[PDB]
Design a protein around this ligand. Structure first.
Ligand SMILES: [Mg+2]
Ligand SMILES: [Mg+2]
Ligand SMILES: [Mg+2]
Ligand SMILES: [Mg+2]
Ligand SMILES: [Mg+2]
Ligand SMILES: [Mg+2]
Ligand SMILES: [Zn+2]
Ligand SMILES: [Zn+2]
Lengths: 343, 103, 218, 132
RNA sequence: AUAUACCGCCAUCUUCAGCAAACCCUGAUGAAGGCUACAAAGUAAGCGCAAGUACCCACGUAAAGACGUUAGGUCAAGGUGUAGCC
């Protein structure tokens, strides 16, 4: 009955069944979810079956300086208005239900190559529009409790960078995905590593290191070489501003340790000015395109050392069997040199 | 337009900007490493297939030897070696056409 | 731009605020700053500041002492002339009264009581949205009662705040920007440091005042 | 665990009003009755009729002023007279407000054979007492 | 028909005191933790406990008693999603 009727919000609650058993324990549902709808906004207070014209709400009260009165909307006008409402609801539902196209990063259903936009503004006011974000991984860690049992909390790792040699990574943990994202983005913009680069696009020299049982070898390359590296390394290099490199990872594959070790290496790298100021000699670069020409890169800011470095033959050097293999060419592997995508 | 004025036009800039054309294109393929041989063609029987390459989807473009600032899009300005079709994201047909055009 | 010129003028001049006249090695030996804990209390990073050992006791290099002290005083006086806010820390209860009193007399501020977690990093949330953190920290006792490095040096190195601490044989001068070797525990040395800082900051303040008065005249 | 005329606590982004924020055991302790009549008192009668007409007119005017209200009604029945008191938002036009006021007044009068008056207080946005 | 879709209403540990948004820090920036007052990293919105109100008091009795566990009970108070008789 009319008295039996009641407000719509409780109807929608009971129809959705948002909470009570389906949600808890994480059992969820087999991909059926009823979307709430607002009919209150849809039709204005005027519409009815009997299309009486109301000068108070439906029609302007005065026309040509003449008062109006109640009148009848005939059958043709009534059905016209009905068709208009039908089509309007159709376009409303169409615009409601549409595709969602978030840029495919590393793969579908993967949160790797997506950017969340620049960092959030600070309280004092600091717009980081130049900074860009990327999400390295996403994993749903669980810890158990007496009353809750399995408790899901999402952890996220993110990195951010200018594109001008300044960047930084961070982590964010929370029950909500967006909240964890925001936490991690703020943490990263607060914790920033800066790294130098030789010609604005490369490291100064080849590096090889290990970090928590994760071995890495990053090799300098000239211009137009490309980025044949892990996808995470490529994202962070895009953020840094360097556009060519080679990189290989062996042993463990853990994203956080990888990022930490890579940033550690790129921060401990040596600049040519520092190396000259340390050694006391003039640096000389030689190219393959340019002939036997000494190209001075940097000189010691202090006084030059008179005697040169004594040429040391058969030096004590630790090197890699993989490097020796690649130099000898006897190595063979179908998976090494491929026609991969753009950079 | 058969001439190369579509590039100097403003619609090309606003649609691409200062970046290359191949930069925005992305391939749908199997997991991890993509196939080493691109699709054979982007159009067939006056019909276009899904996810076509950019030069094929933009019919206004014309692969011509004369458009130097276009044909230099793919070959690196620092390395005279042209890029391969899996790199540029285009089909083999227009790839070969572009190769002989640039030659 | 002339304001920046005035701010930069004292930079090129060394000992421009007359800090060398303040201290002398005689006064240091009188205040017993050369003392140190036993060799068992020795620390690797503090080794090079130790001139030697005697009777299971360590002795500090007073030349390095005076050098670092001159550098630190000149820095503090430059910051005071620049209006940079300075904050003292000394968890030692034996001198909190005196330190707060000399801080009042100087006009500069201090914190002798228990240091609270996240006081500096989360200082915005603690106090308010916009708060002017002190541009310089100093330490009259680097270590806490538990004899571990106070959290303030780490937090300051984090938020890029310079620090000037007097380091005992047990302390870690690695994180400190301008560490001054000395005797943290002796009241004579404590009073000496307090008076030196009083003189320094007061000279800097009055010099800034007279300089800005001269510029207003001109 | 009892759930009665009270709101579940959320993360803290839930604007809540006084009456639905407070519990049903704070009626006389920290609230007032929305309706005011003597049918509940001893000696009188017609309490069922009072209550049914109360709920009827509440739901009626709620559905004839959709999206404009920001609280429950307050009814004041002094002898034969009836006074409705509501709080609404300044969303729609005063034209519509006055027209609907007159319409509802006339309908209530002709239906319940009762002298009726109505008062409403405008607010820019519905007041919030807490964020639950 | 489905309380193993739900709202609405409640049993329950509770004859509990914990639950916690938003920040910071530690662990090599891991799952996670953050307790020492003669004090060593926690700061805490909010909820609840509590306080106060009801009965005869300030005690006592009632009332209240959060986050959640039992897919706890209830489609037969009423309404309602889905599946059905129509
Ligand atoms: Mg997919
Ligand atoms: Mg009960
Ligand atoms: Mg049940
Ligand atoms: Mg009870
Ligand atoms: Mg109570
Ligand atoms: Mg059950
Ligand atoms: Zn094609
Ligand atoms: Zn000591």
């Amino acid at each position: 009955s009319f008295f039996t009727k009641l407000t719509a919000d409780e109807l929608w609650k009971g129809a959705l069944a948002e909470t009570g058993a389906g949600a808890k324990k994480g059992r969820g549902k087999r991909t059926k979810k009823k979307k709430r709808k607002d009919l209150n906004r849809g039709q204005i207070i005027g519409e009815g079956r009997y299309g009486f014209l109301w000068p108070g709400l439906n029609v302007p009260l005065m026309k040509n300086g003449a008062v109006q009165t109640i009148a009848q909307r005939s059958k043709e006008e009534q059905e016209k208005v009905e068709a208009d409402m039908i089509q309007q609801r159709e376009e409303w539902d169409r615009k409601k239900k549409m595709k969602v196209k978030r840029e495919r990063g590393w793969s579908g259903n993967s949160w790797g190559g997506i950017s969340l936009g620049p960092p959030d503004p600070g309280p004092c006011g600091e717009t980081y529009e130049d900074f860009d974000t990327r999400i390295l991984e996403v994993r749903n860690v669980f810890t158990m409790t007496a009353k809750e049992g399995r408790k899901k909390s999402i952890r996220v790792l993110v990195a951010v960078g200018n594109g001008k040699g300044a960047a930084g990574f961070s982590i964010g943990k929370a029950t909500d995905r967006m909240d964890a994202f925001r936490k991690a983005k703020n943490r990263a913009v607060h914790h920033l590593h800066y790294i130098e680069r030789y010609e604005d696009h490369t490291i100064f020299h080849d590096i090889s290191l290990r970090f928590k049982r994760t071995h890495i070898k990053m090799k300098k390359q000239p211009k137009g070489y490309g980025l044949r590296c892990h996808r995470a390394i490529i994202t962070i290099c895009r953020l840094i501003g360097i556009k060519d490199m080679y990189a290989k990872v062996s042993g463990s594959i853990n994203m956080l340790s990888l990022t930490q070790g890579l940033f550690r290496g790129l921060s401990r790298q040596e600049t040519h000015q520092q190396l000259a100021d340390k050694k006391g000699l003039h640096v000389v670069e030689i190219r393959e395109e340019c002939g036997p020409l000494p190209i001075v890169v940097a000189s010691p800011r202090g006084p030059l050392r008179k005697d040169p470095e004594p040429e040391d033959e058969v030096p004590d050097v630790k090197l890699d069997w993989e490097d020796v293999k690649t130099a000898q060419g006897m190595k063979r592997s179908v998976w090494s040199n491929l026609k991969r995508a753009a950079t | 337009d058969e001439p190369w004025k579509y590039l100097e036009s403003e619609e090309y800039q606003e649609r691409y900007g200062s970046r290359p054309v191949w930069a925005d294109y992305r391939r749908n393929h199997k997991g991890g490493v993509p196939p080493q041989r691109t699709r054979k063609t982007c159009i067939r029987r006056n019909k276009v297939v899904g996810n076509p390459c950019p030069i094929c989807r933009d019919h206004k473009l014309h692969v011509d030897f004369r458009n130097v600032k276009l044909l230099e899009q793919f070959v690196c300005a620092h390395t005279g070696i042209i890029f391969y079709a899996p790199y540029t994201g285009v089909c083999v047909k227009q790839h070969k056409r572009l190769t002989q055009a640039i030659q | 731009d002339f304001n920046d010129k005035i701010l930069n003028e004292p930079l090129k001049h060394s000992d421009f605020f007359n800090v060398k006249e303040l201290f002398s090695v005689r006064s240091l030996f009188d205040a017993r700053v050369h003392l140190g804990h036993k060799a068992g209390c020795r620390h690797r990073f503090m080794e090079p500041y130790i001139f030697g050992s005697r009777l299971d006791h360590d002795i500090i290099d007073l030349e390095q002492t005076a050098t670092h002290l001159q550098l630190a005083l000149n820095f503090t006086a430059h910051m005071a002339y620049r209006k940079g806010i300075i904050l003292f820390i000394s968890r030692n209860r034996q001198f909190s009264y005196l330190i707060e009193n000399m801080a009042r007399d100087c006009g500069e501020y201090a914190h002798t009581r228990y240091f609270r977690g996240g006081m500096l990093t989360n200082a915005r949330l603690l106090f308010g949205p916009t708060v002017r953190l002190p541009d310089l920290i100093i330490f009259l006792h680097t270590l806490n009662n538990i004899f571990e490095p106070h959290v303030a040096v780490r937090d300051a190195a984090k938020m890029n705040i310079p620090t000037v601490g007097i380091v005992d044989t047990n302390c870690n001068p690695c994180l400190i920007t301008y560490p001054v070797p000395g005797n943290d525990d002796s009241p004579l040395a404590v009073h000496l440091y307090c008076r030196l800082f009083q003189t320094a900051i007061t000279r800097a303040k009055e010099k800034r005042q007279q300089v800005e008065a001269l510029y207003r005249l001109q | 665990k009892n759930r009665a005329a009270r709101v579940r606590v959320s993360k803290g982004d839930k604007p809540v009003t006084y009456e639905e924020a407070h519990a049903p055991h704070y009626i006389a302790h920290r609230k007032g009755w929305l309706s005011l009549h003597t049918g509940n008192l001893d000696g009188e009668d017609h309490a069922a009729e009072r209550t049914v007409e109360d709920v009827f007119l509440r739901k009626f005017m709620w559905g004839t002023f959709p999206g404009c209200l920001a609280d429950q009604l307050v009814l004041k029945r002094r002898g034969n007279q009836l006074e409705i008191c509501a709080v609404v938002l300044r969303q729609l036009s005063p034209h519509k407000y006055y027209f609907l006021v007159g319409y509802s007044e006339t309908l209530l009068s002709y239906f319940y054979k009762c002298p009726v008056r109505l008062h409403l207080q405008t607010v820019p946005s519905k007041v919030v007492y807490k964020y639950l």
